[PDB]
Write a protein that binds this DNA or RNA. Structure first.
Ligand SMILES: [Zn+2]
Lengths: 166, 108, 279, 149
RNA sequence: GUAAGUUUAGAUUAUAGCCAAAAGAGGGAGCUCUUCUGGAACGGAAAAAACCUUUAAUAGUGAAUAAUUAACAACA
RNA sequence: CACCAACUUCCUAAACUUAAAUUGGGUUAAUCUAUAACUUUAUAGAUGCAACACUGUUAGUAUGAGUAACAAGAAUUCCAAUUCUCCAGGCAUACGCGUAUAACAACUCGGAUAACCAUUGUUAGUUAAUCAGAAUAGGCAAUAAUCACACUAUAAAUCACCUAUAACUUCUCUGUUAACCCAACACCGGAAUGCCUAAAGGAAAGAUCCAAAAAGAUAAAAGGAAAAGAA
RNA sequence: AACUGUCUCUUAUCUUUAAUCAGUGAAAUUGACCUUUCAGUGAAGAGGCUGAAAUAUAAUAAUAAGACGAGAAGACCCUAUGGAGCUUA
C-alpha cells in the first residue's frame, strides 16, 4: 500500500522571497478505505472536476448515490483542515482542482448457489483522491470561432516547409 | 455465447465517459428563507419541517395520553392550546389539547 | 530475495539514472567543478585560436567587476576589464562600420548604424561567446554569467588581443568570427525600415529621379480568400522593381523593399563577401 | 403504455388498492395529516374530497352511512365525519384536501414523498410557499403600468 | 578448356517430396503410372512455393539495362 | 521511332558470389570457488547458469461487466408501541445440533440490501425422591385377541406363585437454554410420534414506470375441431 | 357427439418479466485489433489479400431466417486368411 497523497500535504515550500506572488494554497485529501466501487465513484468525480466548493457541495446534497454523500463528507473534512491548518481566510474561496478514485484492497469469498453451483464473491473497496486549490474555479474555455479557425489554417499553410527538395 | 475477445480499456473508457453516461449537474437548487438551508424549487424545506414534524408528535403524544384508549376519536372538533393561552367562548364544545410549551412563533 | 551483490549494485545504477532524469542537478560553472585549470585552459584557448594573447592582459579582460566584489566580500568575511572593454567596443564599431562601407558605399550611414548595432547586439555577442566556451573562461560571481558582463569581456578580450597581436590580426579575427554571422542575413532582417515607399522616394529625389508610378503587373485570385497581387514600380514608364504580395498595399510595400536593396546594391545575386583574403 | 389511463395500479390487486386506499383514508381522517408516496397520495386525494361531500349530504342518508362504515374501519370515526369534518367544510364548496411535495425519503429507495392534509384542521400550519410581494421592483414597475391604465 | 581425382583406414547422417515441362505405357475425354529436364525474387505475369528476367551482400538524394495483359463485315 | 523499369551490371567506398535435418570451428549472458581487483573489474576452476509458447504449475490483476443476479403489508402517538388489512399446521416429545439461547455495547466483517440482528465484543443462563437416564437354590404351568360374553375362525396370537437361603433403615449423581437438525449456504429439498385446527402460528408490497417482446391468469359477438355422453 | 379462443379471427384486463432510481455483485470467454460493402482469388471458403466503393467522432434501442450454421467418441449397418481376451468336448 502507498500513501503518497498524504505526504503531498506534508510538503513545505521554501520561504517566499519579497519578489514573489502570494502562493495559492493547495490541499490534498483522500479516504483510503471505502466500501464502494471505484468505477461507480469515478462518475461522481468526473462531473465535479473544476467546479467550485459551494457548487459541488450543493449538488452533492441533492444527489441520490451513496458515494456522493461520502464525497461531500470528504470535501468538508478537507475544507476544515484548510482553514485550520492552511491559513484559508474565506471558506467560499475554494474550487475542486482534481477529483479521482482508486482501487482498494478487497476481500474474497465463495458465492454459493442453490443448485450446487458456486461463484466468486468479492468485497470491493476503493480509494478517493481530491486536490483543492484556493480560489474560484478557473473560467471555462471559449470554443474557437470560425474566424479563429480560418486564421490558424492560413497560418498553418504558411508554416508549411517544402518536403524533399534542394 | 461468450465474448470473442477482450474489450480494450480505451473502448471501455469511451463508453463510460460518453456524455450520455455521465452524471448531469442540477440547476434547480434553491435556498430556504426560513432555515437558510438549501432546497429544490419544487421541494420544501426540511430544517424547519423537522420542527413541525417533531412538534406534531409532541402534540399527538399529548392527544394520545388524553384519550387513554383506542377507538376514542371524539365526535367534536379539537383544538390545541399552549401555556399562557386561555380557552375562549368559541372554544366551548371542542376537545382541548394543552401543551406545556408556549405558543410557537411559527404556529398561529 | 535474490542473492548477489553485482545484481544489487546494478539496480542502484538504475535508480540513479531514474533519479537524474527526474531531478536534473542545478547548473554550475566548470570553474567550480573539479579538474579545472584556468592557466591551462587559457594557454589551450590561445593555442586553439592560433592567436597570441598577453596572459596578464587577457586575465584582466576576463576579470569582471562583479567577480571582484565576490572576492572582496569573501575577503571582508585585481584589475577590471572596463579599460580593455572600451577599446574593443570602440575599435569594433569603427572596424565593423569600415566593413559595411567598403562593400556598400551607397548604403547610408544610418543603415550601417543599424547593421553595426545588430552585429554588436548583446544576444549576438552572447551567442558567439557561449558557443566559444568564453562563459567557462569568464570570471564572474554569478552562473550563468549575466549577458552584459559577458559582453564586456568579449570586447575586453578584443582590446587585449589588439595589444598582443595588433589591429591586423584582430580585424581578421573579427572578419573570420563576427562577419561570418551575417551570412544568410537579409538587409531588412538586420535593419528595421519603416515606410519604405517614403524612403525610396527620398533616395530617388536625391539622385534626381522621378518617383515611380505603381502598376499591377499580374493578379490571381483577386476575389478569393487567397489573393496574389504583383505590383511593379514604374519610373518614367520603366519598371524598376517588382514585389509579390497578398494585397496591393503589401505588394507595393514588398516592391519598394526590393528597390531599396537594388538602390544599396544588396541584390540576392550580388557577389558574396570575401573571407579568403589573408591580407 | 399509459395513455388515457385514469386509475393507478396499486397494491396486489384492485381489491388491495381499495383496501390500501381504505386504510390510508381511515388514517388520514384520524390524524388529518398523513405523509405517503406522491403517486398514492395523488390517487387518494380525489377519494377524500368526495368523502367530505358524503358527510355534507347528512347523517340520515343510508348511502352515506354505508359508505362511511365501509371506508372507515374504525367506527369511532363515523360520528366524527358527520359532526367534525362535515360541519367544518360546510362553508367550503371543495378543495378540502391540501397535498404538497415533501423531500424524498433517504431510505435507499428515494421514493417521492408528499403530505396530504385536511384544510381547516387544528394541526400546525404546513410551511406553505409565499408569493413575492408587490413591493418588489418588477411588481412596482407593473404597479406604475396599472396606475397609468 | 580446366583442378581435382584414385587407393588405403575409420565413421555416420540422408534414403518420403511438390509443381512445371518433355518421352513413353495403360486410355479413347481426361486421367494412372514409368523415364528425362528445371524450379524455391526482394522484378514481372493482377494477388501468384512450382512459369519468365535474375551470380552472393554492403552504404550512396548516381548511371546503363532484363523479363514485363495486352492486341489492332469480305470478292473478285 | 523513344522512355520507364530488377543490387543483373557499372559507378564512390567496399565486397569476392545463390535454401534446411545433420556435421566442423569461434564467441557469450548469469551465479559460486581459487587468486586478484575495489562504484563492481581480471585469469582459472565449477554449476539447480539464459523460455513470446507443454488446454504447463503457483500468485496477482484484467475482459465478459458495473452486465446475470438478488430485497421489507398499511397508518400513527412508535422495533419487544398501539391500531388496521390479509394469510392459515400449530404445540409438546424423540432424534440431531451444542450456546446459535438472554441482556448490554459496538456498526468494521457475517444476513447475498437496509431496518434489525442471526454478526463483533462482554456479561449472564437450563434448579426434580414426584420429569428423564444411570441376591441365590429348588418346586410347577394344556385352553389368544377382537368392549370377550355368545360366537366362530386362521395368518395360530401369555414372569407369576409356592419351598428354603441371603441382606437389614435409603435421596446422591446426570439430563433440563435456543428462532436449533440432515442437505458445501439463513438451500422453495429431507425430517418420527402425541394432541388439537386457530384461542396457536403468520405477511405476498426496496421505490418508480406500466415499454415492446415473452410467460401465467381471467373474459368472448357469431360459429363449434374448420361438455363429462357412444362405440 | 358435445364442449370450448384449437381454429375462422383476434381482442381486452390483471400478475411476472420488462424500463427507471438506489445497494450489492458472478459465469462461460478473451493472440492482438484503429473490428465496413461489392467483385475477384482460395481448400465449398475474406472485417484484414487483388481491384472498385463507402466512410465526422462517439453512442442508444430492437429481431433470429440463412451462411446446405458450429458441434461430440450420438444413431444405424457391414468388413477384417486385423488384434487381444475368454472358453473348451
Ligand atoms: Zn427552513
Amino acid at each position: 500500500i502507498s500513501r503518497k497523497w498524504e505526504k503531498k500535504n506534508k510538503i513545505v515550500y521554501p520561504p517566499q522571497l519579497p519578489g514573489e506572488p502570494r502562493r495559492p494554497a493547495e490541499i490534498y485529501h483522500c479516504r483510503r478505505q471505502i466500501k464502494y466501487s471505484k468505477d461507480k465513484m469515478w462518475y461522481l468525480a468526473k462531473m465535479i472536476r473544476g467546479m467550485s466548493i459551494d457548487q459541488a457541495l450543493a449538488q452533492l446534497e441533492f444527489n441520490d448515490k451513496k458515494g456522493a454523500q461520502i464525497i461531500k463528507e470528504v470535501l468538508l473534512e478537507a475544507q476544515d483542515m484548510a482553514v485550520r491548518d492552511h491559513n484559508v481566510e474565506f471558506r467560499s474561496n475554494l474550487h475542486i482542482a482534481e477529483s479521482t478514485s482508486g482501487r482498494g484492497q478487497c476481500l474474497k469469498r465463495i458465492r454459493y448457489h442453490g443448485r450446487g453451483r458456486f461463484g466468486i464473491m468479492e468485497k470491493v473497496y476503493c480509494h478517493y483522491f481530491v486536490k483543492l486549490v484556493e480560489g474560484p474555479p478557473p473560467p471555462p474555455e471559449v470554443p474557437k470561432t470560425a474566424v479563429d479557425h480560418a486564421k490558424d489554417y492560413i497560418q498553418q499553410l504558411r508554416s508549411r516547409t517544402i518536403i524533399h527538395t534542394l | 455465447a461468450a465474448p470473442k475477445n477482450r474489450r480494450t480499456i480505451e473502448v471501455n473508457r469511451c463508453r463510460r465517459r460518453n456524455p450520455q453516461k455521465l452524471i448531469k449537474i442540477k440547476n434547480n437548487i434553491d435556498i430556504c428563507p426560513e432555515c437558510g438551508h438549501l432546497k429544490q424549487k419544487h421541494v420544501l424545506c426540511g430544517y424547519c419541517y423537522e420542527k413541525v414534524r417533531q412538534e406534531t408528535t409532541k402534540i399527538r403524544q399529548q392527544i394520545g395520553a388524553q384519550e387513554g384508549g383506542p377507538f376514542r376519536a371524539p365526535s367534536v372538533e379539537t383544538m390545541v392550546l399552549y401555556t399562557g393561552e386561555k380557552p375562549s367562548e368559541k372554544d366551548q364544545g371542542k376537545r382541548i389539547v394543552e401543551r406545556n410549551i408556549k405558543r410557537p412563533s411559527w404556529f398561529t | 530475495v535474490k542473492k548477489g551483490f553485482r545484481a544489487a549494485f546494478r539496480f542502484q545504477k538504475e535508480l540513479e539514472r531514474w533519479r537524474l532524469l527526474r531531478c536534473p542537478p542545478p547548473p554550475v560553472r566548470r570553474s567550480e567543478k573539479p579538474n579545472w585549470d584556468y592557466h591551462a585552459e587559457v594557454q589551450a584557448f590561445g593555442s586553439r585560436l592560433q592567436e597570441t594573447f598577453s596572459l596578464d592582459l587577457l586575465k584582466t579582460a576576463f576579470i569582471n567587476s562583479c567577480y571582484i566584489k565576490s572576492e572582496e566580500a569573501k575577503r571582508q568575511s585585481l584589475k577590471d576589464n572596463q579599460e580593455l572593454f572600451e577599446q574593443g567596443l570602440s575599435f569594433s564599431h569603427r572596424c565593423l562600420t569600415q566593413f559595411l562601407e567598403d562593400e556598400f558605399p551607397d548604403l547610408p550611414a544610418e543603415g550601417t548604424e543599424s547593421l553595426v548595432s545588430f552585429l554588436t547586439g548583446e544576444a549576438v555577442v552572447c551567442h558567439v561567446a557561449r558557443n566559444l566556451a568564453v562563459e567557462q573562461l569568464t570570471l564572474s560571481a554569478e552562473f550563468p554569467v549575466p549577458l552584459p558582463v559577458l559582453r564586456q569581456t568579449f570586447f575586453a578580450v578584443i582590446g587585449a588581443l589588439l595589444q598582443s597581436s595588433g589591429p591586423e590580426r584582430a580585424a581578421l579575427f573579427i572578419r573570420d568570427f563576427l562577419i561570418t554571422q551575417m551570412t544568410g542575413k537579409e538587409l531588412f532582417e538586420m535593419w528595421t525600415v519603416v515606410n519604405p515607399m517614403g524612403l525610396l522616394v527620398e533616395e530617388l529625389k536625391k539622385r534626381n529621379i522621378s518617383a515611380p508610378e505603381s502598376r499591377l503587373t499580374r493578379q490571381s485570385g483577386s476575389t478569393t480568400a487567397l489573393p496574389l497581387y504583383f505590383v511593379g514600380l514604374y519610373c518614367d514608364r520603366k519598371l524598376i522593381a517588382e514585389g509579390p504580395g497578398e494585397t496591393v498595399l503589401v505588394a507595393e510595400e514588398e516592391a519598394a523593399r526590393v528597390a531599396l536593396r537594388k538602390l544599396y546594391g544588396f541584390t540576392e545575386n550580388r557577389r558574396p563577401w570575401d573571407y579568403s583574403k589573408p591580407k | 403504455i399509459s395513455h388515457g389511463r385514469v386509475y393507478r395500479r396499486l397494491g396486489l390487486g384492485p381489491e388491495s388498492r381499495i383496501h390500501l386506499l381504505r386504510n390510508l383514508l381511515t388514517g388520514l381522517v384520524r390524524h388529518e395529516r398523513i405523509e405517503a408516496t406522491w403517486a398514492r397520495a395523488d390517487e387518494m386525494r380525489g377519494y377524500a374530497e368526495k368523502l367530505i361531500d358524503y358527510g355534507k349530504l347528512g347523517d340520515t342518508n343510508e348511502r352515506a352511512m354505508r359508505m362511511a362504515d365501509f371506508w372507515l374501519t374504525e367506527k369511532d370515526l363515523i360520528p366524527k365525519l358527520f359532526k367534525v369534518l362535515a360541519p367544518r367544510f360546510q362553508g367550503q364548496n371543495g378543495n378540502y384536501t391540501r397535498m404538497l411535495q415533501i423531500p424524498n425519503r433517504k431510505e435507499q429507495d428515494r421514493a417521492k414523498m408528499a403530505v396530504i392534509e385536511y384544510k381547516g384542521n387544528y394541526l400546525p400550519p404546513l410551511p406553505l410557499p409565499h408569493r413575492d410581494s408587490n413591493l418588489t421592483l418588477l411588481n412596482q414597475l407593473l404597479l406604475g403600468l396599472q396606475q397609468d391604465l
